[PDB]
Amino acid sequence: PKIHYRKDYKPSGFIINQVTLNINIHDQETIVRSVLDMDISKHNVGEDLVFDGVGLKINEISINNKKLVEGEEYTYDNEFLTIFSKFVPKSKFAFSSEVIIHPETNYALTGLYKSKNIIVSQCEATGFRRITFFIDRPDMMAKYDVTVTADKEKYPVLLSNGDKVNEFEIPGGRHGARFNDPPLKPCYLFAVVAGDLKHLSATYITKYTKKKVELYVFSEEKYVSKLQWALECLKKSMAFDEDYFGLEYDLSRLNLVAVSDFNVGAKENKGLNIFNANSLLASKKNSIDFSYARILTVVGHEYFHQYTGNRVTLRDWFQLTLKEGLTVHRENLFSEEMTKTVTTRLSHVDLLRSVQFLEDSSPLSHPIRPESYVSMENFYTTTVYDKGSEVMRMYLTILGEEYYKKGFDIYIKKNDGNTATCEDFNYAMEQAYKMKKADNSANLNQYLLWFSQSGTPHVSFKYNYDAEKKQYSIHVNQYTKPDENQKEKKPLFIPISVGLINPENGKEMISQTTLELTKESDTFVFNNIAVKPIPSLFRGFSAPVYIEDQLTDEERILLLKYDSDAFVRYNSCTNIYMKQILMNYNEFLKAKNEKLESFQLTPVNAQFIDAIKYLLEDPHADAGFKSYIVSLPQDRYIINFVSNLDTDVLADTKEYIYKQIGDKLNDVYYKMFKSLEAKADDLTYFNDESHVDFDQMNMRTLRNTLLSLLSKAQYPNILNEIIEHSKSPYPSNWLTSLSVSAYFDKYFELYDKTYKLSKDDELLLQEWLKTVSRSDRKDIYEILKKLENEVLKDSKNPNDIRAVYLPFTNNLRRFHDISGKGYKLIAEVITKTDKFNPMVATQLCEPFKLWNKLDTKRQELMLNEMNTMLQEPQISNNLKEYLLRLTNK
Ligand SMILES: [Zn+2]
């Protein structure tokens, strides 16, 4: 396997000025003809002309309209096409080729492939080489003239980049359309779509130039009634970029297309965004609440690529976080503004500190700008995306809105029409940093370590208050554990948004303050502090770090009740849970190790339980925030604090803590579940797809959370509420009734009931599979066998496979069964999936990422399965590289 290194970048010895494409789609084959108007660059040294071309069947290749001969003039090994330099011209020449590809049998969903009855392309990152020969790297900018022909009955809608400049009939029931896209673009932003698409349409008028923009959202005819919310989110996205960043859409038309078979959430192209159907289609009747925030984020995300991608593209794929981290950052600002709920930011932190922190402490650890790769498809990670977003968000925290918007404008103006790197963005932010501090000697050179240094920093605190002096001191210390990427970790530029809370009245004591920690340790002193405060640290989660607040549970409860910042209250509650979890874990662990006939467990803090009741009973507190405080931290967040985790002991720990709190608050849980029904399940706007109330959906989340707690506790006659819940029109409700019925004899009755409600909608049935998959059933393995034989079958749809297996992998007690049956199960699924889709096979390895953090017996079980999968003779490069790095080989 060839390893690409970031330090080895050098420009190409060739230039591609113009691409002229003819894509002829037939029933059993697709013929691709391409003429490349090329030239010799100033970096040429007379080397061989080597194109990328994977899986192409050559009919002929030429240079200046003279056919080349295989063996003597060129070689092709199904991966690289090598034209020997003695046959390569020294001036402007034309390279042409005709290849045959087969999207009908392209089940890897990369390049050009068929999804149901729609043919679409996925060229990010190295997918264009699967369509035709090219120097498939982002710094090769070219102009595109693309013609597409197909059977008119099967593919009446033809879409590609640029303007549709010609439509013509073809003998034999065929037709063609030609698209010219004059602006230079990299090949990964090439896109083509063909199918019997139906659409919703709207006209958007830009803010400053008053230009009319046509908006189109496409799907198959069956699901055309699920396009309305996506259209609304597109309008919201365009208005937000205009209002926040002052950026207008550059083109006259924008297309969104939903496809059923897709490896990820979506992929941007210039003017034509292609989506996984589950991230674009929704209706109140056929979608759970989660889809509405998901479509909003994903539609906004792909739109926020348009302006920046139209001017500043990536120089190489090591800069992936420059376009991905920044776009997720803009995506999160957008959703925070649109939802107007504190749980939007909380949900982003919750995923980062669980999924991303696990990855950053695993053998897969990498910085947001890696130093090397052999398969680019394996570095579209939560580190590059979500930690990258947090690093881009810290620029805004450090600079504030005004100077951040200025640094953003500098970045575009300085690099417009060219490729850029992470250093280019840091330079533009540095120029804004010098302007804010009013000191042209200031710099952000230390900030570059956020791009180069792996691992999660640890930030610890000590305090001192001199009552006589009214002087308060915060001693801060930072540290990053050494790993395989750096033996010596350097201190980072860590912004710490802090407040000081008066414990006597809950009032703020200082104005907005962001501490700038740039050393291994520092002491920040505050004068005129009238009383000893309680510190509110890392407000808004101002840095991607482990926070060790060193506060007592009494101080954390006071923050939980009275602090102004949603994250610090959420983090204080998290800290109290973790202290309880680690204590009860060790007590169960030593009782199991010493084989005790009797032992003691430390109760949950009674004042902590009283505080939760205080907040739950507050009518003016946020329902989404309430659902967070009644839920223990994620398992994947807990495992970052326990060595040799025994999953059975952790399950017993969570079980004890939940029942301790339920033993006191279940009457309050039931009262809230009943009082919340009116507003949470209000049907006033059930048939208005464009009316979305994120506050209302958070009420449903709280009801579904409390109903789960009450069902686990076997609350008296709670089955009556479960049966009634089954009849709610909201899929979030009646799918919850299925999962909570797992603790009752009526489970399979609701199983069949909800299946009948889900089977006729493709996306809804996938949500039903997820609900069954995550059901806390003792017979879950037999239920999974029923899903395979009766529903899933031999489906190659990644949404089907992921829905059946991934939620089951989070069942702490059953997936981690000590026999290893759960590991053998997923291992068989990955190997089966790797035969037709390596990218989805790698995604299904997610449960193995924590393998070296479990008890010794489970480490052995997981490692044995991973070594079994590595010995498969037909293993893909993607899966092999992933498992090699994960097992430290
Ligand atoms: Zn993106």
Side-chain angles (χ1 to χ4, degrees), residues 1 4-6 8-9 11-41 43-56 58-66 70-71 73-89 91-103 105-152 155-209 211 213-284 286-350 352-376 378-401 403-405 407-412 415-417 419-467 469-480 482-486 489-503 505-519 521-589 591-745 747-755 757-777 779-781 783-784 786-793 795-823 825-834 836-856 858-879 881-889:
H4 306 77
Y5 294 82
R6 181 181 64 90
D8 292 338
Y9 173 81
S12 175
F14 298 89
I15 308 177
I16 300 180
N17 295 324
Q18 173 78 232
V19 183
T20 308
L21 270 174
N22 281 85
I23 302 174
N24 311 113
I25 301 170
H26 300 274
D27 274 325
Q28 331 282 21
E29 66 182 7
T30 291
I31 291 180
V32 175
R33 300 163 22 230
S34 159
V35 174
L36 302 184
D37 297 309
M38 295 166 67
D39 199 350
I40 291 308
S41 79
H43 309 102
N44 184 273
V45 294
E47 66 275 30
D48 289 342
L49 173 59
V50 183
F51 296 103
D52 300 274
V54 175
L56 310 183
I58 294 181
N59 277 348
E60 56 177 329
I61 73 172
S62 302
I63 282 172
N64 295 320
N65 291 322
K66 180 168 170 52
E70 174 171 49
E73 307 181 329
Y74 78 88
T75 67
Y76 176 52
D77 62 353
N78 204 40
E79 184 179 13
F80 302 105
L81 155 68
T82 289
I83 300 171
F84 305 113
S85 58
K86 89 180 285 193
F87 307 105
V88 175
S91 184
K92 288 189 177 181
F93 63 95
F95 170 93
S96 63
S97 72
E98 188 189 63
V99 300
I100 294 191
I101 56 180
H102 303 84
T105 57
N106 186 170
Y107 308 124
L109 312 193
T110 58
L112 184 70
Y113 68 94
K114 187 176 186 292
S115 169
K116 198 176 298 188
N117 287 324
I118 305 169
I119 288 178
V120 298
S121 67
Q122 166 54 263
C123 296
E124 177 156 18
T126 61
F128 190 77
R129 67 188 62 172
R130 302 187 174 266
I131 303 178
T132 189
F133 294 107
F134 208 76
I135 307 180
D136 192 350
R137 31 188 287 182
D139 57 340
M140 304 301 291
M141 313 289 283
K143 321 208 304 184
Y144 282 72
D145 190 315
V146 184
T147 300
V148 188
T149 73
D151 174 84
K152 190 162 181 193
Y155 308 101
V157 176
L158 311 187
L159 300 171
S160 194
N161 312 281
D163 309 290
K164 183 169 63 170
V165 297
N166 201 212
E167 290 173 310
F168 53 94
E169 298 302 274
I170 299 171
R174 292 179 64 93
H175 70 144
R178 164 180 185 185
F179 297 79
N180 193 38
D181 194 11
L184 292 170
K185 66 161 173 293
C187 58
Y188 79 88
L189 290 173
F190 165 84
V192 60
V193 174
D196 188 11
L197 305 174
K198 309 303 176 175
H199 66 268
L200 295 181
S201 198
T203 300
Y204 190 94
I205 300 198
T206 66
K207 183 169 187 171
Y208 301 106
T209 67
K211 177 186 61 177
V213 182
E214 291 293 282
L215 310 181
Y216 282 84
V217 191
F218 298 91
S219 75
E220 57 175 305
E221 181 177 11
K222 179 179 177 182
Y223 302 126
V224 69
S225 68
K226 302 173 70 176
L227 298 166
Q228 292 162 61
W229 178 236
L231 180 53
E232 290 300 312
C233 295
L234 190 50
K235 295 171 174 164
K236 288 173 161 62
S237 305
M238 300 177 71
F240 176 82
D241 252 343
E242 288 177 338
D243 298 339
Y244 190 91
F245 288 105
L247 313 177
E248 293 184 332
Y249 185 66
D250 291 314
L251 313 182
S252 65
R253 179 169 165 167
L254 177 44
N255 301 112
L256 314 186
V257 183
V259 293
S260 300
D261 303 88
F262 211 80
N263 290 334
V264 292
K267 182 241 184 302
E268 85 288 6
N269 318 269
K270 301 177 72 173
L272 173 55
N273 292 335
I274 306 175
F275 307 72
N276 191 325
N278 66 18
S279 301
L280 198 69
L281 311 181
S283 72
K284 262 74 174 297
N286 295 316
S287 303
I288 64 170
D289 292 358
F290 174 88
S291 300
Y292 284 89
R294 166 75 177 175
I295 289 165
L296 177 69
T297 59
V298 174
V299 169
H301 184 108
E302 293 325 325
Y303 177 75
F304 299 147
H305 268 300
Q306 300 302 308
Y307 196 94
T308 50
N310 273 323
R311 293 164 178 79
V312 187
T313 62
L314 302 186
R315 183 195 75 179
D316 54 79
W317 287 122
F318 300 93
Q319 325 297 329
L320 181 64
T321 198
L322 171 59
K323 85 176 175 90
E324 282 317 324
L326 178 58
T327 301
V328 176
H329 169 57
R330 278 145 58 71
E331 153 192 359
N332 286 343
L333 294 178
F334 168 69
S335 301
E336 286 175 57
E337 185 73 23
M338 294 296 102
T339 61
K340 286 304 181 180
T341 58
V342 298
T343 60
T344 303
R345 175 63 180 163
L346 299 190
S347 69
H348 308 157
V349 178
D350 205 80
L352 186 84
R353 303 205 289 179
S354 54
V355 173
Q356 194 280 321
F357 278 11
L358 192 166
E359 177 172 271
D360 224 340
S361 68
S362 75
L364 297 178
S365 191
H366 55 283
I368 64 183
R369 177 164 71 175
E371 299 294 331
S372 61
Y373 69 84
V374 317
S375 189
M376 202 54 236
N378 285 340
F379 288 88
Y380 286 71
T381 46
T382 178
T383 296
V384 173
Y385 273 63
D386 299 310
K387 175 173 174 170
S389 66
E390 292 300 293
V391 175
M392 297 296 180
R393 181 183 185 273
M394 282 189 287
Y395 283 119
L396 172 61
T397 305
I398 294 164
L399 284 155
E401 282 202 4
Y403 283 99
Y404 175 79
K405 285 174 185 183
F408 192 90
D409 284 332
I410 295 184
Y411 167 70
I412 299 183
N415 311 277
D416 184 9
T419 59
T421 65
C422 294
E423 292 89 343
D424 292 317
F425 196 86
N426 193 76
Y427 176 85
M429 291 295 149
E430 174 177 292
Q431 305 305 126
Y433 188 64
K434 307 188 187 206
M435 295 175 55
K436 185 190 199 225
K437 294 293 230 287
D439 174 18
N440 301 124
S441 68
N443 66 90
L444 296 176
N445 203 243
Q446 178 183 16
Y447 198 90
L448 286 177
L449 294 174
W450 283 112
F451 289 97
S452 64
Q453 193 170 282
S454 68
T456 308
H458 296 76
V459 180
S460 54
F461 294 88
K462 298 189 182 216
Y463 316 101
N464 183 250
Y465 179 70
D466 193 301
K469 284 176 178 168
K470 320 302 174 189
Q471 200 176 242
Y472 185 68
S473 298
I474 301 181
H475 311 293
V476 189
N477 174 280
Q478 74 160 289
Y479 159 83
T480 291
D483 57 34
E484 306 296 331
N485 297 320
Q486 284 94 27
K489 304 287 186 179
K490 300 182 195 287
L492 304 96
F493 191 134
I494 301 188
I496 315 183
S497 302
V498 298
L500 298 175
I501 300 308
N502 184 330
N505 62 8
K507 285 292 201 305
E508 309 281 331
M509 304 176 76
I510 61 176
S511 55
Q512 167 157 52
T513 300
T514 298
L515 313 179
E516 291 180 358
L517 173 65
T518 57
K519 306 149 196 169
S521 61
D522 212 343
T523 297
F524 306 89
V525 184
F526 308 80
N527 289 130
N528 300 131
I529 307 303
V531 299
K532 178 176 150 117
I534 298 187
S536 178
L537 301 171
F538 285 107
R539 283 181 165 178
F541 191 60
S542 66
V545 296
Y546 285 110
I547 301 167
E548 287 142 41
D549 59 21
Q550 289 291 117
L551 316 165
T552 70
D553 282 346
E554 176 193 42
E555 292 174 322
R556 285 161 176 167
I557 289 168
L558 278 172
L559 290 178
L560 176 46
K561 298 178 68 180
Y562 302 116
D563 191 7
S564 59
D565 176 72
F567 161 82
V568 178
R569 311 171 64 196
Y570 159 87
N571 196 40
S572 295
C573 180
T574 297
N575 293 157
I576 295 162
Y577 274 133
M578 294 295 313
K579 178 160 178 282
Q580 190 65 23
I581 288 167
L582 298 184
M583 189 183 307
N584 293 146
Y585 176 88
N586 291 317
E587 282 162 349
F588 275 118
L589 178 66
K592 173 176 173 177
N593 287 338
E594 299 170 4
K595 298 191 174 184
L596 300 189
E597 302 299 329
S598 67
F599 62 100
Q600 282 154 241
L601 300 161
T602 300
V604 174
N605 188 311
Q607 285 65 232
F608 176 53
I609 297 176
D610 287 338
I612 300 180
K613 178 173 177 292
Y614 173 89
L615 295 179
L616 289 177
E617 294 185 334
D618 192 342
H620 308 135
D622 182 87
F625 178 79
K626 291 180 188 190
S627 71
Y628 276 93
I629 67 178
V630 293
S631 307
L632 262 62
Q634 294 283 326
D635 290 345
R636 287 175 283 190
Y637 178 80
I638 297 167
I639 199 177
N640 285 310
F641 305 90
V642 183
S643 298
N644 304 320
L645 168 84
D646 188 317
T647 56
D648 289 319
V649 176
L650 176 58
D652 292 341
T653 298
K654 295 166 52 185
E655 173 183 69
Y656 171 75
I657 293 172
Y658 271 118
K659 184 130 192 320
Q660 281 270 302
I661 300 177
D663 279 342
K664 290 208 197 180
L665 309 189
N666 279 347
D667 287 336
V668 164
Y669 292 170
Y670 181 79
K671 180 180 185 181
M672 296 174 59
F673 177 84
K674 301 298 290 182
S675 63
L676 285 164
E677 178 182 355
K679 292 183 178 180
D681 293 1
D682 175 31
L683 294 181
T684 297
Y685 298 105
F686 189 82
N687 284 126
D688 181 345
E689 268 311 312
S690 69
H691 182 97
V692 172
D693 189 333
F694 291 91
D695 285 333
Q696 173 175 19
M697 296 191 289
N698 275 337
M699 293 177 182
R700 291 208 276 275
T701 292
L702 175 59
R703 291 193 80 235
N704 292 140
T705 304
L706 300 172
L707 182 60
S708 176
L709 298 175
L710 294 168
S711 303
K712 173 78 208 228
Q714 297 294 284
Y715 194 75
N717 305 320
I718 195 58
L719 184 60
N720 288 326
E721 269 76 23
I722 296 177
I723 298 300
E724 285 306 300
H725 214 55
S726 89
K727 302 161 198 189
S728 173
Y730 285 109
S732 291
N733 283 159
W734 54 261
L735 280 178
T736 295
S737 72
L738 173 52
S739 41
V740 305
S741 88
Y743 310 102
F744 295 93
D745 59 8
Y747 175 75
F748 282 117
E749 178 181 300
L750 293 182
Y751 176 106
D752 304 333
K753 174 183 174 63
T754 56
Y755 171 81
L757 300 137
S758 313
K759 63 180 182 64
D760 294 326
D761 182 285
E762 172 186 271
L763 299 182
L764 183 52
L765 174 60
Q766 294 167 356
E767 293 302 328
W768 179 85
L769 290 179
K770 290 179 180 172
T771 308
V772 173
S773 176
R774 64 177 179 86
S775 294
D776 180 18
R777 291 286 296 186
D779 61 341
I780 183 65
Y781 283 88
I783 292 179
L784 293 177
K786 186 178 194 187
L787 289 187
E788 296 172 343
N789 295 326
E790 302 184 1
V791 185
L792 181 68
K793 300 187 186 302
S795 174
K796 295 180 177 60
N797 189 325
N799 293 343
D800 291 331
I801 305 173
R802 288 187 292 242
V804 169
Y805 293 110
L806 280 176
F808 153 78
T809 65
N810 296 286
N811 178 327
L812 190 61
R813 221 182 267 281
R814 298 266 69 90
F815 167 71
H816 290 284
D817 186 280
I818 201 51
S819 64
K821 61 193 297 181
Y823 311 155
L825 198 160
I826 315 299
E828 288 165 351
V829 175
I830 291 154
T831 293
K832 182 186 191 233
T833 308
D834 193 50
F836 61 88
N837 195 320
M839 287 175 49
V840 177
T842 301
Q843 296 177 357
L844 292 160
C845 295
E846 185 172 7
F848 290 104
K849 298 175 73 177
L850 46 68
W851 70 272
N852 65 344
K853 298 292 179 293
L854 310 174
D855 56 276
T856 57
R858 300 198 157 84
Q859 296 191 35
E860 162 190 83
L861 293 187
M862 282 193 166
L863 183 57
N864 289 3
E865 297 293 343
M866 279 183 298
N867 291 338
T868 293
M869 293 183 284
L870 278 165
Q871 300 299 343
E872 285 295 339
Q874 314 297 329
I875 192 179
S876 67
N877 297 325
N878 287 25
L879 180 59
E881 179 229 34
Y882 188 82
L883 293 179
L884 281 179
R885 289 187 289 113
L886 180 55
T887 62
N888 262 130
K889 299 198 187 99

